[PDB]
């Protein structure tokens, strides 16, 4: 009866409340996706339980086991009823799970420590001094690996065989690496996260150039799930009423520190 | 077995070629959606016939008869198998037809004749010498009618009662009205069209301010159509491969004349 929602601890989408240890259930969490989940559930008429994905991953199929990990895996193997998180709609995922229309629009972007002499993906691909990588088990990494576009293919060829590994387990790891490499490391991540970090202390990173592509986040459900239709219509309704724009302003800029 | 595609004459999505009169069938047309249709048909493996929507409209429901017009209507009443055009994904439409994930992201925008003292929707709403309206039977008009946001709610109350009518039958009429009103008419239309016209002679218009919202265009099919699934996956692949971005650059800026 109670809908099991899988999500991920990724600021500002889902974060632990400062006093979480003294709270119970859903009240332990706060953020863009926590607010969105409450709204979706209310408009669809269901009770739910927020659960943090076990492996803390978004979702990718292991090439040798062919088993899906992350929130995608939670949906595919029946551990969760729905995923409400900054989960990117992609072809490989849409083949195994359903997605509502996008509740957020974004694109792969470049994050640099302020002062880094880099203004585009082309700038990165033509140099070697500054290292650059992406998030593991994410859609950005999958994008580069499967891209036939000149500049991106070249970037992927470098990243896949760069040593030490230029990939990170979480965005927080990528951000920290950018901040500590004194401009010698650039991080490729979605514009949404890039823009968020750019508004947080110590205000030493920035998004440079335009986005490399265009995509969106969607609320996901198991393939053929009955919840799918209601959830999709709810997302459209909430977007048309400006709720999503309000949540973005609330968590990104109203609370900005820079 | 030939798929009947309903579309609309809206540059640069679908336009008649210069020598269209000596051409036949699909060959008569060119544009972003013409190229998209060919790609979709190729990847989904079907032959098709492009047909221009009879009433030249996108799609809205008549409040009294409850009858859908435009391309939406042709899908709903079984006149076309698919709609490949700059058709906006909205709640009221999704309730009667199916939409693929978006192939283009955009938002409502403000078109002004260069020099017009307007920088935002708030500005328009706070004044009256400059009239403004939108396209009839389109998603922008519906947006304003259904929006509960203060500023947009106010703008709607004004447009719905304005006399003469501030509404137009086609974007071409709206653009023409802007160009001939010596700055006394502002046109509310989607950013895609606004940005296109801004790169067209006589280069006397421009998009001002940011978008009023975020939405997307989707390929539409009759609710429950067997084609929906393949088409949706086709759109996702084309976007990930960079084709959609390629077509945008091809029809918007590579051919810009300003
Ligand atoms: C968040 C987030 O921020 N940046 C990324 C990325 O993959 O670069 C992600 C994960 C991505 N949305 C996905 O794999 O769904
Ligand atoms: C194109 C196009 O460009 N501007 C508009 C509009 O409704 O303002 C439209 C129509 C809209 N995409 C729809 O009603 O689907
Ligand atoms: Zn804690
Ligand atoms: Zn192709």
How was this structure obtained? X-ray
Q: What is the Cα A31 distance to its own chain's centre?
A: 14
Angle between helices B227-240 and B243-252 (to 10 degrees): 70
* Contact of B96 with B68, CB cutoff 8 Å: yes
The candidate with the shortest Cα–Cα distance to B237, out of A92, A188, A149, A62, is: A92
In chain A, DSSP finds a helix count (H) and a strand count (E) of 10, 13
Rounded to an integer, what distance in angstroms lies between the CA atom of residue B124 and that of residue B119?
A: 8
Q: Out of B147, B218, B233, whose CB is closest to A91?
A: B233
A242–B147 C-beta distance less than 8 A:
yes
| Mutational pocket test of ligand 1: of A13, A32, A60, A139, the residue with most ligand atoms within 8 Å of the beta carbon | A139
Calculate ∠ Cα B243-A245-A35, nearest 5°: 115
- B22: phi then psi, degrees, rounded to nearest 5: -100, 15
The candidate with the shortest Cα–Cα distance to A91, out of A38, A31, A147, A16, is: A147
The candidate with the shortest Cα–Cα distance to B151, out of B192, B86, B89, B209, is: B209
A95–B233 C-beta distance less than 8 A:
yes
Residue of B nearest to A211 (CA): B245
DSSP single-letter state for residue A128: S
What single string gives the DSSP state of each residue in chain B?
--EEEEE--BTTTBEE-TTGGG--GGGGEESHHHHHHHHHHHHHT--EEEEE-TT-----B-TTT--B-HHHHHHHTTS-SEE-SSPBP-HHHHTTEEE-S-SEEE-EEEEEETT-S--SHHHHHT-SSSEEEEBTTSHHHHHHHH---HHHHHHHHHHHH-SS---BSSHHHHHHHHHHTTTSEEEEEEHHHHHHHTTSTT--EEEES--S--EEE--EEETT-THHHHHHHHHHHHHHTTHHHHHHHHHHTTT---
Calculate ∠ Cα A135-A139-A144, nearest 5°: 85
Structural domains for chain A? 1-106+216-255 (3.40.190.10), 107-215 (3.40.190.10)
Rounded to an integer, what distance in angstroms lies between the CA atom of residue A139 and that of residue B62?
A: 42
Q: Rounded to the nearest whole angstrom, what is the distance from the C-alpha of residue B247 to the centroid of ligand 4? A: 12
Binding-site residue numbers of A are: 86, 88, 93, 139-140, 190
Angle between helices B150-161 and B139-146 (to 10 degrees): 120
* Contact of A245 with A103, CB cutoff 8 Å: no
Q: What is the Cα A159 distance to its own chain's centre?
A: 20
Sheet arrangement for strand B220-222: B48-52, B3-7, B82-83, B220-222, B97-99
Rounded to an integer, what distance in angstroms lies between the CA atom of residue B21 and that of residue A51?
A: 62
DSSP single-letter state for residue A19: T
Indicate which ligand has the atom closest to the C-alpha of A29: 3
């Amino acid at each position: 009866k109670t809908v099991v929602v899988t999500t991920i601890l990724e600021s500002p989408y889902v974060m632990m409340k400062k006093n979480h240890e003294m709270l119970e259930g859903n009240e332990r969490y706060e953020g863009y996706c926590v607010d969105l989940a409450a709204e979706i559930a209310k408009h669809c008429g269901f009770k739910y339980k927020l659960t943090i994905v076990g492996d803390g991953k978004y979702g990718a199929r292991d090439a040798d086991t062919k088993i899906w990990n992350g929130m995608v895996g939670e949906l595919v193997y029946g551990k969760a009823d729905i995923a409400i998180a900054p989960l990117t709609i992609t072809l490989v995922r849409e083949e195994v799970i359903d997605f509502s229309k996008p509740f957020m629009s974004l694109g792969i972007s470049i994050m640099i420590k302020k002062g880094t002499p880099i203004e585009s993906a082309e700038d990165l691909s033509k140099q070697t001094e500054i290292a650059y990588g992406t998030l593991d088990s994410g859609s950005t990494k999958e994008f580069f690996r499967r891209s036939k576009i000149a500049v991106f293919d070249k970037m992927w060829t470098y990243m896949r065989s760069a040593e030490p590994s230029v990939f990170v387990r979480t965005t927080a790891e990528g951000v920290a690496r950018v901040r500590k490499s004194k401009g010698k490391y650039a991080f490729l991540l979605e514009s949404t996260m890039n823009e968020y970090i750019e508004q947080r202390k110590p205000c030493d990173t920035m998004k440079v150039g335009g986005n490399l592509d265009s995509k969106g986040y969607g609320i996901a459900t198991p393939k053929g799930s009955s919840l799918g239709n209601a959830v999709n219509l709810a997302v459209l309704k909430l977007n048309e009423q400006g709720l999503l724009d309000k949540l973005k302003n609330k968590w990104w800029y109203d609370k900005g520190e820079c």
